[PDB]
C-alpha cells in the first residue's frame, strides 16, 4: 500500500541520511598503514596525509579499506544466505510459507530496505538477487580511480552494512522456516559448552564453519542408525548454534554439543579429542590439515568455497574413500554431495576412533620440563603475541616448578600459534600452555540457551510499558567475535553487571558461548539465573551470527508498533526514530572479522550506537561526535519545524573501549535518548552515575547536561545532587518544593518530537 | 639503563619511525613542553608505575588524562586528572579549536605511559598523521607511531629509567 | 543444442582444468608486502613463509591478494555492463535483435561459458544475473578463514577472469547493438588523437571515465544545436574510444577528439585547456576537483560510482546550477539526470570559456628560471618517482640553461605529481617538465582507427588455415593500460616490428591510442600505413577494453568455425584447442589496474600466454613453466590416447619483461604451437632467430629443441643450421640429400593431434 | 666513499630490511662465495658500468646472467655471459633441483647490478621469502629485499665504490 521514498536503495538515495549522520558523528580515521599496495603505480606513501599517484589521500585510503571490509562481510552473509536458500528451495519446495514466529512483520529488515512483504520462500528469491546486483556495483568502487572523497566511501560502506543486514535476515528466515528452528521461544533448550564436555571415550565428529546444510545430513544419518548414543558431535563457531537449533522447537535436549569459539579451534585439534573434522565455509583456520595430519585427524571439506587444496572425490564410492583416508596418502577429501558426506563422516569417524587412540600434542611431564628448560628468554614470543602476553615471564617462573602463570595465560591466549614460529628453540608454547591448563580445561563446562530466533510482537509490547515507566534502563546487545583483549570473562562480567541492574541483554554469536561458560559459586550460569524472555533482567540468545538481523529488526519493530510508522522503504524515518527514541547499545568486545564490521556499520546506519574492543581500532574507521561544539546538537521539532536542543547522547555511533569497566560506563551512558520522559531519564542517570562511581572512583562531569527537570535526578541522592547543582553550577532552585526553577538549558516537554529530517515537519 | 637499544618490532607501519631517545632527552622534552598532557592508561595501576607517574605529573604540574579505567588510582592522589576516552582524545587532538580539559586550549605534547601497543599505536596513527601534536612515549614498549619513544625495556629497566627521568625533571 | 560438460561453471566445475593448467605452469608468487592486514588479529608478519594467526602463509596471502585484484576487475567490468544494459533497455526496450555484424556466433564468450546463444537485448539480462551471483560467491572468499590453499585461490582467480571476459563481452554487445557502433568494419574512420589536436580558442569539454551514457546525451545536444563546430569535445581513457565509435557506422569521420590516456589527465588539467570536465566511472584521478578549482575548471559527476563529495543537484534547475558554478559558490556538481546533464555540460562550457581566459598552471620563463634555481638537489623527487627518473639531474641541467633533459623526461613521466609532494622547495616539477616540453606538446598529434568491434565470419574462415597451420607467424594482441616503464614509444616500436614481419596485430584500450601517436618520415601513423582487416600485416583496433573480449572471442571462433568444435559449455576443450594449436600472444606493457589483471587471468584460462611490463611484477602472481623438466611437456593423442612429447612452447602463461626488445623476443618465441606444420614452424623459427640476433645479439640457446624435420628451418639458412646441429649436438644428417637421419626428440606427424585432456582421446 | 650513510626509502616491504654493507665487506663476500652468479640487467650498458661489471666478472670468473637487453653488451667481451629472463631466473632460484645456466646445479649467492629498483625488489621478494639464496646488490639504489645492499649513492660515488671493490678483489 503506502510506500516510502527509498525502496531498493542505492548509493545516491541513502546519501542524504548518511551525510546527516556524518555531520554530527564525524568519521575518525586511524590508518593501519602508511602505504597503499593496490596497484602497480604503487605502493604509494600516503604518510602525513599525502596523496598517491591517483590523487587519493590517506583518509580516502582508510575509508576505502573499511568499505572493502564492510562489503566483504556483506558478501559473506549474502552468499551464505543464497546457498542456504537455494538448497532449502530445492529440498522443501518454493511454495513453503514463511513460519518465523508470532509476529506482524516477519521480515523487518527486508520491508525496511526493499519495501516488499515476502510471504513464501520464493518471495525471498528476488530480494537476494537485488543484493547481489548491488554488491557488484559496490565492488566496482574498490577499483583504482573510482572515488575521490572519503565521505563517498563511508556512505557506500553504510549501504553495504544495510545490505548485509538484509542478507542475514534472508538467511536466518530461510533456515528457521525450513529446518524447524525454535520460533521466538523464551524457553529454548540448554546445551553444553566447553572443551570438557566431549567424552573422549566415543568417536568424535567436529564441525567447523557457518553453514548447516551438510551438518543436517550428518545428524540425520546419526539419528536414523541410532548412533546418537555412541558418537559425539561438536560444533565450533556459529555452526554449533545452527546444529543445536536443528528441530529443537519442541525443547527436547539436544545431543549435539558446542565446543567453543574460534579461539578453541586449534586447541581442540592439539588435544587429540576430535576423530574426524568437517569444515564448511568460514571462520576456519587455514592450517587445520597441517596440525591434523601430525595427529592422524582426517579433515573433510564440504563446500566449493573451501576446498583446502584437497582431492575432489565427489563422484566415487564411500568405501574407497574410507579405505584411502584410513590407510593411504590423502588426509581428507572434498565431499560436495550432502547425502554422501552425511553417510561418509559417521562411518569414517567410527573406523578412525580405534586407530588414532593415544595420539595428542600435549607433552609429557618430563617432556614439558625439558621444554620449559630449553628457553633462553629472547623475547620474540612476547613480541609476536597478538594479545601481548608476558610469555617469557611465565616460562621463567615455570623453570622453577611454578606452572600457574601458564594456567593464567591459558584464558587470555587465543591459540593463534604466532609465538611458536618465532622461537629459535622450537618450543611448542601453545602445547605447553595447554599442558599447564589441562585441569582447568577438564573443568570447563557450561550451559547456553539455543537460538530462539526473533523477538515476537507480544514481548515488545510487554516491554514498551516497562521502558516508558522507568523500570527498564535500556537494551544492551552483546554480540561479535571472540578476539578479546583480556580473556573470555569480560563479556560475562559485563552481562552480569547489566543483568543485575535489570537491563535487557540480548546475546548472539561467539559472545553467547563465552558468556555461558562461567558457572557461579552455586554452579549456575547466567542463562539459568535469568530467563530467556524479552523483559527486564532477562537474557536471550538469538542464535548464530546471521541471527543478529533480528536484534536490529527489533528496533525497527519498536518504530512500527508504538508509532505506527510505515516500514516499506522508510530507512531514513525509522533510523531517525531509533536514533532519537529507542535506547539500545551494541557491544562487540572481540570483533575481528569483516562480518562484524558489516554488522556494526549496518547498526550505525539504523541509529544504534556500538562499543567495540580495543582491537577494533584496527578497522581504520570510527564515528565520534564533538561534545564541545554546541551547534552540532540541534534537531527540528516535528510539530513546529523550529530548532530544538538535545542532550549530547549518544555521543558516538561506533567507538572503541580498552577495559570492560570503561565499556560498562559507556554502555550505561549511551542508553540515554533525547525523548526520554522523567522516569526513564531518572533511571538511566541513576545507573550511569552508579556505574561511573563504581568503576572510575568519580561521578561524571557531564551529568548536569542531562537534567531538564527536578524529576530527572536519582531518587537516593536527590538533595545531595540538587545542592551540587545550586552550588557548583549556580542554578536557581526552590527548597520547599524541591523544584528546579531555573538553570537547565532545555525545558522538559514530553510532547516534543525531535527529527533530523526537515521533510517530515508540519 | 640505556633505553635506545632494543628498537625491535614485529610489524611496521611504514618508513617513518619513532625516535628512540635516552632519559636525558626525554627529561629535556618533558621540561620544555609548552602545554603537556600526561595521557595515562589502565596499565599504570602497578604500584611502582602509579607512584612514578604521580611523581612525574606533580614534578612539572602536568595535567593528566586518565584514559581507560585508571581514574581510581588518582582519586586519593593530588595530581589534577580527568577521565576521557583514548579514541575520543585522539579525535579531539586533531582539532586545533578544542578547548581541552581545562578549557584553556588544545595541547602540544602528550606523554604516554601504560598502554597496549595495538591500541595506542592505532590512536597515534590518527594523532600523528592528521595533526601536529607531538607524542613522547615513556612506556617499556617501543611505540612506532610516537614522535619520540623509549626502546624495548625490561620491567626493572623501565622502573630504573622512570626513576632517572624523575631525578632529571 | 549439443551442450558441453560445464554449464554455468563454478569453482568446482573448472577446478580440474585449472589444476591441469597449473601442473604445467607453476604459479610464481612475488608478494608486494610482507604483512597481512585483513582482520584485527593482525598485522601478521608473514616473512619467510610464516603463517598468520589464522594459519594462512605468505604464498596463500599473495594468492588471496591476486584473487582480490581479479575479482575487483571482474566486478568493475560486470557493473559497467549491468549499468549499460539497464540504461539501454530503458530506451530501446528489451526485444531488439542483436546485430554485431555478419557472422553466426554473435556471442562467443557467452556461448563458451554459459552455453547460451542470446538473440535479443533482454536475453542478456539472465547472463548478468548469473555473473552477479558468482561475483558474490567469490567475494565471500576474501573473508578471513574462507580458504587456506594458494592453488584453490588461483583456480578461483582464473574463474573470476573468465567471468570478466563474459562481462566485457556483454558490455560491448549492448553498446554496439544499441548506440550504432561500427559493425566489424575493416574500414573504420580515422580519428585525431593527441595533446595538440585540441583547439584553445573554443570552449572545451573533457570527458574522463568509461561510461558513454551521458556523453551520448552531450553529443546529441551538440549535433541538434549546430555546436559541433563552435566548440570541442575531447575524451580520455576508453570513454574517448566509445565516444568516437558512437554513431559511426556510416564511416564518416567524427568530430569528437581523443586527448590521451590516464597518464595525461593531470597534464591536461595543468594546461588550462579544458573549460569543463565530466567524470563518469573508471580510471579517474581522485584530485581533479582540487586542481580544477585552482584553475577554475568546473567538474561534473554523472554517475553513482564516482561522486567526489560534490553536492547532489539532480533535482535543481540547470540555470541555478550554472549560475552557482559561474559565481564560484561550488567547485562542481553531481547530475544523475542524463537529459539535464546533456544540456548543462555544453551550456556550462560555453558560459565558462570567456570567464577563465588566460588562466593556466604553466609557469612563465622567468618563473621557470626561478623555480629551477630554487632546487638544492636533495634527491627526494627521484626517490618518490614511480618511474625512477633522475629529476635532480634534469633540474641541475636546467640550471645551466639546458632544458633538453626535462624535455626528454616528459615522455617518460606518467604525470602523477608524486614528486611535488616531497619537495621542501615546493617546486611544481610536473609543471616545469611540461613547460620545458611545450615545444613537443604542441606537436602531439596523430591518427588512430576507431574500434571495429569483432571479427566477421569471412575473415575468420579465411585466416583459420594460416592460423592453425602456422602460415601466419602468429597473432599479437596489444592490450592494457599506459603505465609504461620507459615511455609510450615502446609499444609503437613493438607493433611496427611485428607488423613488418607479416604478423596480425590487434590493439585495444590505451595502447591503441598510444601506438598511433608516432609517425614515420612521411608523417603517417601505423593505422594509416597498414590496413585493418583480420589478415597478416594488418593492424586492427577494437576500441575500449570492454571490446578486449572480442580478441579472446576471436580465438574461440577459430576453435569453432574452422575445426567444427562445439562452443556451448565447452570451456576446457576450447581452451585446450587454443593452447595446443592457435598461435596467439598478448602484450600488456603498461598494465596497472585490476581490470587488466582480470583480463590477463581470463586470457590465461583460455590458453593465451601474456607478456606484461615490469610494473606488472607488482601483481603478485605469474605463471611460469619449468623448461628443464621433461615430465611437464607430455600430452595425449586425440586418435590413440597415448603419450606424446611436445616442444616447450609456450614456456609461460603470464610473465614480465624488463625491456621491449626482450618483449619482442618473447612474443616471437611464444607464438609456436605443437600443431604447426613444417612451413609454419619454419616461419616462426626464422622470425624468432632474426629477432634474437637483431636485439639480444646472440642466436637462441634452445632453438634446436623446436626442430623435428629438415623442412622445419628457414630456407636461406638451412645449410648453416644443419652445420650448427651437426658440430655441436652431433646429429646424423645426410649431406647428399638434405635430411636428418637421427638426432631430434619429437618425430614429425601431420595427422598427430595433441590434447591435454585424457577424457577427449 | 662511504656506501652505508644513505638508506632512505619511499616505501617498506616490512620490518626485515637489507643490511647496509661497505666496499670491503662486499669484496670479501664475493671472494668467499663458492658458486656465485652475476645477475646483470639492461642497465649495465652504461659505458662505465659495463667496464666495472666486466672487471668484476673476470676477477673471480663469475658466470653472468644477462636479463633484458644486456646480452649485446657481452657478445664480444671474453666472458661467460648467458641470457635468461629475470622473472624466470627468480622462479628457478627457488627450486633446489635446478641444473642452472652452466649445467652443474643451482647457486648460493647472486650479485645484482644495473637493475630497476621496483622490478628487482619484486623479483627478489620471492627469492628472499622462498629460498636460501643470498643477495648482494652493488647497484646505485638501496634494494630492501636483498640480503646485503649498497646504500643510496650518486653516480660518481657509485663508480668510485665499484672501482674500490674491484681494486680490493
Ligand atoms: S595496508 Fe597492508 S597490504 Fe596495504 S600497503 Fe599497508 S601493509 Fe601493505
Ligand atoms: S590506488 Fe592510488 S594510492 Fe594506491 S597504489 Fe595505486 S596510485 Fe598509489
Ligand atoms: S621465543 Fe622461545 S626462546 Fe625466545 S623467549 Fe619465547 S620461548 Fe624463550
Ligand atoms: S598462540 Fe596464544 S600465546 Fe602464542 S602468540 Fe598466539 S595468542 Fe599469544
Ligand atoms: S586474515 Fe589471517 S593472516 Fe591476515 S591479519 Fe587476519 S589472522 Fe593475520
Ligand atoms: S625534492 Fe625538490 S629540492 Fe629535492 S632534489 Fe627534488 S626538486 Fe630539488
Ligand atoms: S609526476 Fe612524473 S616525475 Fe613526478 S613522480 Fe610522477 S612520474 Fe615521476
Numbering used by the authors:
A (entry chain A): 40 to 801
B (entry chain C), D (entry chain D): 2 to 170
C (entry chain B): 40 to 800
Paper lines:
Carbon monoxide dehydrogenase (CODH) and acetyl-CoA synthase (ACS) play major roles in the global carbon cycle through the consumption of CO and CO2 gases, production of acetate, and breakdown of acetate for methane generation. By contrast, methanogenic archaea employ four copies of CODH (α2ε2 heterotetramers) and eight copies of ACS (β monomers) that interact stably with eight copies of CFeSP (γδ heterodimers) to form a massive 2.2 MDa complex called the acetyl-CoA decarbonylase/synthase (ACDS) complex. ACDS plays a central role in that process, wherein the A-cluster of ACS cleaves acetyl-CoA into CO and a methyl moiety, the C-cluster of CODH oxidizes CO to CO2, and the corrinoid of CFeSP receives the methyl moiety, which is reduced to methane in downstream methanogenic metabolism. Through plunge freezing of the ACDS complex, we captured multiple subcomplexes including a CODH tetramer, a CODH/ACS pentamer, and a CODH/ACS hexamer and characterized these subcomplexes via cryogenic electron microscopy (cryo-EM).
